[PDB]
């Protein structure tokens, strides 16, 4: 069925909090109908299919997320299912036109290597950029702590978008680094 917004993360020093918007039953039903009448708020949406859940981040009026989460699926919306505007399987990246009411991040232009990752539990954790698509976690955490966060944003100190979280680099269940899709690839995907 469709991807369904089931909660959101609202960003403020960078702080974040989460709010549930849908229960499990309404989620399954909304997935089948593709029709979602709820108001959307926040920069990050917690999204779910019938089988898995993850995050989507809105940057410049597009809601972006990971292909391994969303596949080719539509996003449930007020006028029915929304077709993907961008589908880049190789970069593991999909996008839908952002619901009205979602607040867009703007892409980072400062080039800072001092980043923050916002997790599914609305924790904001320090990351050090280590190249185009990798950052080290300055404080390693169990991978369990990052479960459900695929598609979440990496932010620079000014709260602009650097990338979206794709995968964790792990040894023995401890996440030491993150792999991400740089905001540049969103620009390349678009134009």
């Amino acid at each position: 069925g469709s991807v369904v917004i089931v909660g959101r993360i609202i960003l403020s020093p960078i702080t974040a909090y989460s709010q549930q918007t849908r229960g499990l039953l309404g989620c399954i039903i909304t997935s089948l109908t593709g029709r979602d009448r709820n108001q959307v708020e926040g920069e990050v949406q917690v999204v779910s299919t019938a089988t898995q859940s993850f995050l989507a981040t809105c940057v410049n009026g597009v809601c972006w997320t990971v292909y391994h989460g969303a596949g080719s699926k539509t996003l449930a919306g007020p006028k029915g299912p929304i077709t993907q505007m961008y589908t880049n399987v190789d970069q593991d990246l999909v996008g839908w036109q952002a619901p009205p009411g979602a607040r867009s991040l703007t892409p980072c232009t400062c080039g800072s290597s001092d980043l923050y990752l916002v997790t599914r539990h609305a924790d904001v954790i320090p990351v050090r950029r280590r190249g185009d698509s990798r950052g080290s976690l300055l404080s390693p955490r169990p991978v369990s702590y990052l479960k459900g966060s695929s598609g979440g944003p990496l932010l620079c100190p000014s709260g602009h978008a650097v990338g979206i979280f794709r995968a964790a680099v792990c040894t023995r269940g401890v996440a030491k680094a993150v792999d991400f899709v740089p905001v540049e690839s969103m620009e390349t995907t678009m134009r």
């Binding site: 549930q20 499990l24 989620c27 779910s48 859940s53 993850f54 964790a168 680099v169």
Partner: peptide, 17 residues
């Protein structure tokens, strides 16, 4: 180090048992 994917189960607060 190897790549782990971080999908959880369905719903806002996925049920684990």
């Amino acid at each position: 180090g190897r790549l782990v994917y971080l999908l959880d189960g369905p719903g806002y607060d996925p049920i684990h048992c």
